[PDB]
Amino acid sequence: AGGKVTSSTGIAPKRYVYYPGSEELGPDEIRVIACGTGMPTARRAQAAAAWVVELGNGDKFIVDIGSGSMANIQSLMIPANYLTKIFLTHLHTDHWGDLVSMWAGGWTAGRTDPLEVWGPSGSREDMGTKYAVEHMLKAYNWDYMTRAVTINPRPGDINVHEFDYRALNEVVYQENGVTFRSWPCIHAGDGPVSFALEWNGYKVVFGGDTAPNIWYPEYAKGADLAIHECWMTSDQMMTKYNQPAQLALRINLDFHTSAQSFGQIMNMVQPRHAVAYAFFNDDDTRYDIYTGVRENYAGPLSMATDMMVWNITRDAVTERMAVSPDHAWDVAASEYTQYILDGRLNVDEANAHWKQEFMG
Amino acid sequence: AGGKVTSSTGIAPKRYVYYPGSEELGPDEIRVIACGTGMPTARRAQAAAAWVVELGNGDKFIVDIGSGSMANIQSLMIPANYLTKIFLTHLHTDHWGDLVSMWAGGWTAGRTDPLEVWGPSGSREDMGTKYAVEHMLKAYNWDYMTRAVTINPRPGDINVHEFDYRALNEVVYQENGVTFRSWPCIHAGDGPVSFALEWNGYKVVFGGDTAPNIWYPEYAKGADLAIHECWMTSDQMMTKYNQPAQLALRINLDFHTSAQSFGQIMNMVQPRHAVAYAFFNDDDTRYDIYTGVRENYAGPLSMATDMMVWNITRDAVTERMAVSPDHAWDVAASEYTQYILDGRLNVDEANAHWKQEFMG
Amino acid sequence: AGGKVTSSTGIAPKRYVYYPGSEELGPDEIRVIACGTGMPTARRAQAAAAWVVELGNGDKFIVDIGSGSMANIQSLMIPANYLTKIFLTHLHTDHWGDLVSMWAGGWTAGRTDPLEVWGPSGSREDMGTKYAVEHMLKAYNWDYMTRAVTINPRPGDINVHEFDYRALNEVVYQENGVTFRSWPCIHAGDGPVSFALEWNGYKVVFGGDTAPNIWYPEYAKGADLAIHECWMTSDQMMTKYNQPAQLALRINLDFHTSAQSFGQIMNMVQPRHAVAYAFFNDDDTRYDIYTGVRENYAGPLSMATDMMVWNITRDAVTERMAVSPDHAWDVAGPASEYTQYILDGRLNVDEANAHWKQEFMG
Amino acid sequence: AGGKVTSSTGIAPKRYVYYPGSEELGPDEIRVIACGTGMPTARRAQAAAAWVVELGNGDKFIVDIGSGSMANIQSLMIPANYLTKIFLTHLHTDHWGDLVSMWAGGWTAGRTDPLEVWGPSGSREDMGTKYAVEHMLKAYNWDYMTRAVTINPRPGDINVHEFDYRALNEVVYQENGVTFRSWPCIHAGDGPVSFALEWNGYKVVFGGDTAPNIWYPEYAKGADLAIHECWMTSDQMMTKYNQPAQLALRINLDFHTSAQSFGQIMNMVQPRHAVAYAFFNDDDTRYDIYTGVRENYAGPLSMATDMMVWNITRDAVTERMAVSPDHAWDVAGRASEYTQYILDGRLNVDEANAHWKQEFMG
Ligand SMILES: [Zn+2]
Ligand SMILES: [Zn+2]
Ligand SMILES: [Zn+2]
Ligand SMILES: [Zn+2]
């Protein structure tokens, strides 16, 4: 598997796995990494929704930054200041829970520019991204004010770009040859969108969460990579949750996109490559989910899980797994009263040994 | 290792690893699980500070709940209803980032009681935990209101119980024979505290984060299990961050508790079992930190990483590693406008087959 | 998922994962654990073929024990002396390379009984299981003789029970309620067999490796659990090994059982539960294979991977995943070969060991 | 950590982890990977002893290839044809258990040369490497004879280079400016050795298994990288095994090199970098072993676990961890043994396979 090795001391070419930080990105290539793929229950195997997109022009975007996804995003060996632009499909903790982590960790990790967040409005002020993010910064006001005494507060700003959720396939971002469009989703309440990324003849669709809708099939048409919610089966709902027959059946019709509905949508969409995500990707769930899609869609399919990567080139959309470090590292008025400062323990004795040795 | 197997068809007793959900807890026993141990930066290997405490009387506590920890907590096979009481040491993202996941996750996962949070105050209203939590709920208003359409709101609420950060060893909690005390830390700015749980002759101390202070040694004295911050070497600061000598030296004296200061501190306390946490616990970092602690302390010492467990009994404080599921599961006015509900797609034909088989 | 918790202090019943050593086995119950499932190349995610069978009467059997599988077997918290009976389908290293590790490791782990091995003959002495084990013990003569000096050598013996590979469903083991029968496979050359284990109304079938054959569908009929070979697609063969199309086609027709053939077989067999194994179980292989299978078979299916487990009860065959320790340890159950030339090289380390020795001796 | 990233679209330089297959090896550089580091009992976290050595002149070696290590070796994306030369310290299953897997595996993975094995003689013919490998090939005769019907048999040969175990720091190998030398160990019975590899101004020492001896401290002197056995404490022996106090004591003195002894040895050697291995590398074991060493040795020190790697340059010896695929694959670089009796048993599967077959053929 992978490219043929041509020398003892050389580099293995077109490696069968993606090692993050190890591969040059071509000027007509997109890299998409799933840094989170699993619904609202927390689990080490699948963080909540998060996508990192690297474009051959040097631009990088995050779409969704769900609870737990930062551990994956930090494993990519991308400097913080290259990852400042974040698009939110909607305000479920499982789609922006780890914004606080990117904001706080990313700042310690050496980001020098503000975060730029694009997110939907809701049906009223207090149901949109602008309200949400302003209250998140106040929530973490003790973190912000204590950090800023010692680090210039510029990287701690969040420039929110709130776009109308109601808009049908309109531009929300246009810069340096890159366009994002939003259209609505049907999910929990008014606000959630899907995004389409267009650049250099490539189209990547980030479906977010939704029950099936008439917009995604129309506006996602002929995507290189189409990502859509794809729910576990009703049988699995009963087995895993103790759900009645009634509630279990209702969930795959009104609340979530069934695997079979996902099939229908990708049959309509005709993408180069479809990606099902949101479900628990386990040895006893994945197969009946896959069979559901296959009733209705026959074309190229990935069943998303954490750290799956797609390379989009003119000739191919190639699925691989990313092999990254679990033991990840970053790659490159006082708020104290005299009362607290007075409580410092003397430790000059215990430290004098290591201390003298280090200063030569 | 472990106890002697006695039958072919039996159960291994006194197992050398802790399997969460597999062991009855004794009426005179405590269980502490590190659900996060590793600070500023995210990494799959170490979530941010979180501690689960199980008492033999049946009360369960969480002390800190940092970004990432929810995936560890959910691998314990504990129902949502039994984890409702959370204690924060401070308002750093890496000690309450996942409170939102516990909040939103537990509520979709059958929890029937609100969360209860105890955390300190700051030098002023916008620097304490009552401000923090109020603004977190506003930040997640879209999630709050959308969820409340389909699930009684009472679990969504968060009874906060702010207490003065300046107090020197004062009860902040007392129900069902359990007592928590707090006292100050010297960390980033005014507000951060350490806790001491006293129950049924047992004392467990959670140091949160701090530079070495005079209150910890005095109020921690004779704990069964004593947890305190312990940091990377100055040499490791220079190698991992390219910090110059001056800044590297000073971070181990002014800003954080050195390995050697950790030792001095635990010598004064003389606990049954000391725990060092907060450092990145890697094959090249951990070793020199242990040689630091052992310059000044010779009693029983754990170097925490995630899913490390302590059984506190009358006889012993015993460290094991927990071996828990990566593929974890939960164990047991509308906010839509007609503009959105008008976009629902017809999937009836796509879904007819599985529907018909599922009804028979 | 799993059973409802009904106390803060208590045990979570009927767990959604198997924690090895944590569950009582019922008298009318079988536990089968996959301790390897993977093709002829090594990888940490899949050891080479290995099955542990636990019967409710307290009998335990290893069927196949390929390279890598011992790390999985040793994670089950089963004492070495309970795992003394081993059945080999065939003499590929991926089916018995770890017998050496069970022999040596299991002994230091506290086996006190000799190992017992059942395996086919071949077309001549030197192609059979007796020859192979006999010469495996000679290969490890240095380990054996050095170990045996001061110790009872009884646990180092391997008693081989060789049986005629050509026999059509004949008994090869009959002890304490338990029957094993074997029948041929078609695979590399004469010798490889499949096994049926019959006990207390249950029938577990271990296919080993084969091209599709007329025996397996006859003698596996009605198995509670039927394990059979199932191969990567020809397309996967061309992607992963740059096979020309001609050879890739033939690999799935002549040498191995295809997913579609596997489907034809389990349709014919009609078990309570079919297991597919012996393929690399990856995010980009597994789906095409499940599809191939479902063309022809509609009944309960497991796609095996390392540490998958089935509970066979009267009422269900239940698949779970085992969650076991990676930092495993053995669990307890109930003429010198030195010259003076080598022993005169011992380094004086009294000084260096003084401090720890004194503390330890009180 | 790591080199400064200079470009959005470019490669992270001097990565803080080693991704096997992602780095050019310099002409005056050595890379050493631990592919097994673990005690005598099997576990997923730690294979039995195996070291992969890559030199900047293109030569590659394996020193030891204990049970389980092939999974780690196969994760390095090194073609089978570059990994044909194997050095064994001694004939414990934990130091050559996976020779069979490399032999069979690398032959299907496409090796086109014979394996070349260097190993020690014993006090008599049946205690040496030549006798061991001979009987290993007879053991796996069914695998060899069946494989040889469809693949050229040349790469199925193992050329054994047996060397005098008794020799004191003599050459066992000299080729292309690369030397290996051997000297005795004190371990189980006569036969075990340590190696030193000398090339282009560099010296790398592979200790094997030994109680403290007078030869390692003398011949390992001034090594760039010095590897030596280093055991778990007597307290840990008592806890993990329930050894009675006096047995636990003797194990750290007569049978195995204690942490303190290792310290004395490395204090005498003065290597650029020392490596302790063979102990179960756990949260409740590793720290007291490290303490023990630091009683007697203060220089640079690695506590080996699986997939740790050392880069050796003129400037430095750098420890990192290797991050490699669990889901590994190969990377590319006579009479039949069937009787008609077996071949007559083929199943008709023409119908089940017609659909995929027609589609695949265009
Ligand atoms: Zn959502
Ligand atoms: Zn803090
Ligand atoms: Zn075979
Ligand atoms: Zn040995």
Interatomic CA distance for residues A190 and A129, integer angstroms: 12
Nearest-CA distance from A82 to chain D in Å?
Answer: 7
Q: Which residues have C-beta within 8 Å of that of residue B302, sequence separation ≥ 6?
A: B273, B274, B275, B276, B308, B310, B319, D283
State the residue for tokens 């309200």. A131
Give yes or no for a contact between B187 and B194, defined as CB atoms under 8 angstroms apart. Answer: no
Cα–Cα distances (Å) from D213 to A186, A358, B295, C23, C142, in that order, read 75, 35, 31, 48, 21
- Domains of chain A, by residue range, sit at 30-359
| Interhelix angle D286-294/D259-269, nearest 10 degrees | 40
Q: How far is C351 from chain A (nearest CA, A)?
A: 25
| Angle formed by the axes of helices A141-148 and A99-108, nearest 10° | 10
Q: Kindly determine whether residue C327 and residue D249, on different chains, have CB atoms separated by under 8 Å.
A: no
Residues, CB within 5 angstroms of ligand 1 (ion): A 92, 209
Q: Could you tell me the two tokens for B190?
A: 């005014």
Residues of chain B contacting C, Cβ within 8 Å: 1-2, 4-12, 15-17, 19, 21-25, 27, 54, 56, 58-60, 77-79, 82, 321, 323-327, 329-332
Chain A closest-CA separation from residue B170 CA (Å): 16
Q: How many CB atoms lie within 10 A of CB C146?
A: 22
Query: Of the candidates C12, C17, C325, which has its C-beta nearest B17's C-beta?
Result: C325
3-state secondary structure of A60: strand
Using DSSP's 3-state secondary structure scheme, residue C261 falls into helix
Beta-carbon count within 10 A of B203 CB: 22
Q: How far apart are CA A50 and CA A33, in angstroms?
A: 9
DSSP B244-272: -HHHHHHIIIIIS--HHHHHHHHHHH--S
Question: d(Cα A183, Cα A221) in Å, to the nearest integer?
Answer: 13
The number of angstroms, rounded, from the C-alpha of D138 to the middle of its chain's C-alpha atoms is 24
Q: Are the CB atoms for B331 and A241 separated by under 8 Å?
A: no
User: Which residue out of B39, B92, B93, B296 would a mutagenesis test of the A interface target, given it has the greatest number of A Cβ atoms within 10 Å?
Assistant: B93
Residues A287, C283: C-beta atoms closer than 8 Å: no
Neighbours of B284 (CB within 10 A): 19
Q: Which two tokens stand for residue A74?
A: 């930090």
Using DSSP, state whether B96 is helix, strand or coil.
helix
**Token digits of residue B90:** 């401070």
Token pair in block for residue C69 = 């599988």
Alpha carbon C92 to its chain's center: 13
Please check whether residue C74 is in contact with residue C106, taking contact to mean a CB–CB distance below 8 angstroms.
no
Contacts of B149 in chain A (CB under 8 A): 188-189
Gaps after residue numbers in chain C (C–N over 2.5 angstroms): 334
Neighbours of C4 (CB within 10 A): 11
What is the distance in angstroms between the Cα of A92 and the nearest Cα belonging to chain C?
23
For residues B161 and A114, what is the distance between their CA atoms, to the nearest angstrom?
A: 34
Q: Do A142 and B245 touch (CB under 8 A)?
A: no
| Number of CB pairs, chain B paired with chain D, less than 8 A apart | 41
Under 8 Å between Cβ of A297 and A269: no
Q: How far is D35 from chain B (nearest CA, A)?
A: 15
Greatest Cα pair distance, chain D, in angstroms, is 74
* CA pair distance A155, C336, nearest whole angstrom: 72
Q: How far apart (Å, rounded) are the C-alpha atoms in residues A228 and B227?
A: 45
Ligand that comes closest to the CA of residue A88: 1
Residue range C17-361, CATH number: 3.60.15.10
What tokens appear for C175 in the block? 């002890």
Angle C99-108/C129-139 helices, nearest 10 degrees? 50
Q: Smallest Cα–Cα separation from C338: which of D287, A218, D250, D255?
A: D255
- Cα–Cα distance measured from residue B237 to residue B231, given in angstroms and rounded to the nearest whole number: 10
Q: Helix (H, G, I), strand (E, B), or coil: what is residue B211?
A: strand
Please state whether C188 falls in left (phi above 0), alpha (psi between -120 and 50) or beta: left
Cα angle value D315/D318/D323 (rounded, 5°): 145
Indicate the CATH number for domain D30-361: 3.60.15.10
> Starting at the edge strand that comes first in sequence, how are the strands of the sheet with D50-55 ordered?
D158-163, D115-120, D85-87, D60-65, D50-55, D30-36, D308-312, D317-321
For residue D306, what is the nearest residue in chain B, using CA coordinates? B283
Read off φ and ψ for residue D64, nearest 5 degrees: 75, 145
3-state secondary structure of A143: helix
3-state SS, residue B238: helix
Q: How far is residue C261's CA from residue C297's CA, in Å, rounded to a whole number?
A: 10
Q: Which of C19, C119, C23, C139 is nearest to C65 (CA)?
A: C119
Touching C: which chains, 3+ CB pairs < 8 A? A, B, D
Name the residue among D21, D54, D321 with its Cβ closest to that of A15: D21
Q: How far is it, in rounded angstroms, from Cα D41 to Cα D24?
A: 36
Q: Å from D239 to nearest chain B CA?
A: 7
Distance (Å, whole) CA C66 – CA C97? 5
Q: Which residues of D touch B (CB under 8 A)?
A: 1, 16, 239-241, 282-284, 286-287, 290-291, 294, 301-303, 305, 308, 319-321
The residue in chain C having the minimum alpha-carbon distance to the alpha carbon of residue D148 is: C188
Q: Given the DSSP bridges, would you call strands C317-321 and C308-312 parallel, antiparallel or unpaired? A: antiparallel
Does residue D234 contact residue D116 with C-beta atoms inside 8 Å? no
A/C interface, count of CB pairs below 8 Å:
41
- Is residue D225 within 8 A of residue D63, CB to CB? The reply is no
Which chain C positions have a beta carbon within 8 Å of D149's beta carbon?
A: 189
- Under 8 Å between Cβ of B93 and B67: yes
Name the class of domain A30-359: alpha beta
Helix (H, G, I), strand (E, B) or coil at C219: helix
Q: What is the identity of the amino acid at C292?
A: G
Ligand with an atom nearest the CA of residue A95: 1
Resolution value in angstroms: 2.2
Radius of gyration of chain A (CA): 23
**Contacts of A309 by beta carbon, 8 Å cutoff, 6+ apart:** A18, A31, A32, A33, A34, A319, A320, A321, A322
CB C289 within 8 A of CB D244: no
Report the residue of chain C nearest A322, measured CA to CA.
C283
Q: Enter the tokens of residue D217.
A: 């401290």
**Nearest Cα to Cα of residue D168 among D213, D118, D209:** D213
Ligand minimally distant from the alpha carbon of residue B48: 2
Decide: helix, strand or coil at residue B3. Answer: coil
Q: What's the rounded Cα separation, in Å, for the pair A311 and D162?
A: 50
Cα Rg, chain C, nearest whole Å? 23
Task: Please judge whether B22 and C16 are an interchain contact, meaning their C-beta atoms are less than 8 angstroms apart.
Answer: no
CB C80 within 8 A of CB C57: no
Best D123, D250, D356, D359 residue to mutate vs chain C (most C CBs within 10 Å): D356
Which secondary structure element, helix H or strand E, spans residue C277, and what is its range?
strand C274-277
- Which tokens belong to C46? 């899949």
Residue with tokens 């490669």: D11
Contact at CB, B321 and D283, closer than 8 angstroms = yes
Extract the tokens encoding D137. Answer: 């090939």
Query: How many CB atoms within 10 Å of residue C3?
Result: 15
Q: HEC string of chain D?
A: CCCCCCCCCCCCCCCCCECCCCCCCCCCCEEEEEEECECCCCCCCCCCCEEEEEECCCCEEEEEECCCHHHHHHCCCCCHHHCCEEECCCCCHHHHCCHHHHHHHHHHCCCCCCEEEEEECCCCHHHCHHHHHHHHHHHCHHHHHHHHHHCCCHHHCEEEEEECCCCCCEEEEEECCEEEEEEECCECECCCEEEEEEECCEEEEECCCCCCECHHHHHCCCCCEEEEEECCCHHHHHHHHCCCHHHHHHHHHHHCCCHHHHHHHHHHHCCCCEEEEECCCCCCCHHHHHHHHHCCCCCCEEECCCCEEEEECCCCEEEEEECCCCCCCCCCCCCCCCCHHHHCCECCCHHHHHHHHHHHHC
Report angle CA B148, B153, B156 to the nearest 5 degrees. Answer: 100
CA dist., res. B54 & res. B292, Å (int): 31
Which of helix, strand or coil describes residue A146? helix
> Would you call A89 exposed, middle or buried from its count of C-beta atoms within 10 A (0-12, 13-18, 19+)?
buried
Whether C1 and B25 lie within 8 Å, measured CB to CB: no
d(CA D228, CA D278): 8
Closest to A38 (Cα-Cα) out of A28, A52, A48: A48
